[PDB]
Amino acid sequence: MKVIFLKDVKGMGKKGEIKNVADGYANNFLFKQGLAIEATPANLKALEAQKQ
Template identity: 40%
Template sequence: MKVVLLENVKNVGNKGDIVEVKDGYGRNFLIKNKKGVIGNKENIEMTQKNKAEEEKKIAAERQAAIDLAKEIDQTEITITERAGEDGKLFGSVTSKDITERLEKEKGIKVDKRKVELEMPIRNIGRVEVKIKTYQGVTGNLTVIIKGEV
């Protein structure tokens, strides 16, 4: 019996797959629990159409993320914090500070969890910060830390 899976089923297949299963398993488990539908011509065509739409959507999201990463690469922000005479900040600059300043100055909204900082910035200077925009796509933001006495 052919079944089109509506969700991931362990040891059978993933959502959207067309699988061949035994009749009893298909009728009594997959279809009854709404984990799949009978693999007739209409359901198979609908599944293939949905897969194509999903791929287009993913491609559009990826392209938007690549464009955002290019914009971030060309962006430079300045953050001014209190610092001592030796160039060390009294506090630190965190990913939250960076995302707030980026949104305020440039209008680019990024989730603070996407900013890849190993440790908060504690010194004056120029720092390259990686910002992940999509899986495998990152942009390098230039952050200039200035100190005020």
């Protein structure tokens, strides 16, 4: 699973970084805790638009 971090997770990734991680971790921890979202082209396009 490719994710973009929304918050800093020490030892894992900083806000704005894009990293591939185990699906279980993404689904059960990162997404569950609101720390990241999937880095799909669609999500990235939407995130860029809001920042601008």
